[PDB]
Design a protein that fits this description.
2 copies of one chain form a homodimer. Chain A has 6 helices and 10 strands; from the N terminus they run βαβαβαβαββαβαβββ. Chain A is α/β, with parallel strands linked by helices and about 220 residues long. The first copy, chain A, has one domain: 3-Layer(aba) Sandwich (Rossmann fold), CATH 3.40.50.720. Chain A has an 8-stranded mixed β-sheet, sandwiched between helices. The N and C termini of chain A lie far apart (about 45 Å). Strand 10 of chain A pairs parallel with strand 6 of chain B, so a sheet runs across the interface. Chain B: GO terms for molecular function: nucleotide binding; oxidoreductase activity.
Chain lengths: ~220, ~230
């Protein structure tokens, strides 16, 4: 019956506070994370904030590509105004010291899931008015951080991918808007959720934290 | 025997690099999906250089475990240069993408490259005369319309390799990491020569100027913190 905002990585940080912020505006939510327990506590808070919001919970491990497909297929019929790819995590270590099981999971979450779901959403929504895709990158996706080479690399992917998707849509007159948030790698999750809201409401492709000042602006990378 | 290891060996820069390094008497490990193509390249390498030793590894590097198996199977061999040339591109709007192709692209361009880079760096950072080369693209520094996803994989490769290269330099490592960025000269034979030139230089980046014009040995293009 409603319009929905889909949030992956909903159980923690930016995703948690964004779900809370959007409920405060009477929005309905699809909340995606691995831990049913975190999802259900967030849902309790959200219905406390906005009892008329509809809350759909999806317990899924997005590091498995088939789960990712299943998730999207299971939401295809919903009216979705906003999709937010916030799943993912980082790492601090020299390359020679990396734990490969972690870094492989990171690639599957930060890159594969984000790409699969971005691609499916765009497929179905590029010509639908009022729709927005937001991918969560990092300031480290625009400036490499020592001891976080691999994490930064995934965020250069997210930033270049989303900047390119955003301009491909804009320059071809699509109705869907794509945007990338680059938090520093303002401190609190709740403040980050406000920046995300700022970005969605904005004309800007990029909302990036430097100064630790938040800036709304256009693509950082060269485009041909 | 002192080996040079080449993924995507049966294609493009990998194929001409194998022949160039055969011309200089080098032994090779050649990694590609199709045994048929690997055996053809070996015979050409042996034609050029009969005393080159050539080990062939038929493997689908789009499976993460296969990537580990490949590396384990070569683990104790003596490798002076590792070249990650596996992968491929795509032209299509994001709305038009074939997902299976894109997902394989990510597993090959990014995952295989990252796992093998990581494993090589782990066992060789301390070893003199060693070089890791990752084959990226001019589209890994400038986004090309209609190849958004491909370009994003190559931004990954470029950022990863630049990051890793400066990390090894700051840490006083003997291993050197380098990235090659051909456009999106022109022949694969010339690119192999440019690559050899990159391996010998001090430069982290060998890039073909994307407007036009030829090869440039240079430092990192991306922003780096300290």
């Amino acid at each position: 019956h409603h319009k929905y905002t889909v949030i992956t990585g909903a159980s923690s940080g930016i995703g948690y506070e964004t779900a809370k912020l959007l409920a405060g505006k009477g929005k309905s939510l699809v909340l995606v994370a691995r831990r049913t327990s975190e999802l259900e506590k967030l849902r309790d808070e959200v219905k406390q904030i906005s009892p008329d919001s509809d809350v759909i919970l999806k317990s899924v491990d997005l590091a498995d590509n088939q789960n990712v497909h299943d998730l999207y297929e299971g939401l295809k019929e919903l009216d979705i105004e906003t999709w937010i790819n916030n799943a993912g995590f980082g790492d601090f270590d020299l390359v020679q010291d990396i734990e490969l099981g972690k870094i492989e999971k990171m690639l599957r979450l930060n890159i594969e899931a984000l790409t699969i779901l971005s691609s499916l959403f765009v497929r179905d929504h590029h010509d639908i008015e009022g729709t927005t895709l937001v991918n969560i990158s990092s300031a480290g996706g625009y400036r490499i951080v020592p001891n976080a080479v691999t994490y930064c690399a995934t965020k250069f992917y997210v930033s270049a991918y989303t900047e390119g998707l955003a301009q491909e849509l804009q320059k071809g007159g699509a109705k869907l808007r794509a945007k990338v948030l680059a938090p520093a790698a303002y401190h609190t999750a709740a403040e980050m959720a406000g920046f995300l809201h700022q970005l969605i409401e904005s004309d800007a492709i990029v909302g990036i934290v430097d100064t630790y000042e938040f800036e709304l602006r256009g693509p950082l990378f060269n485009y041909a």
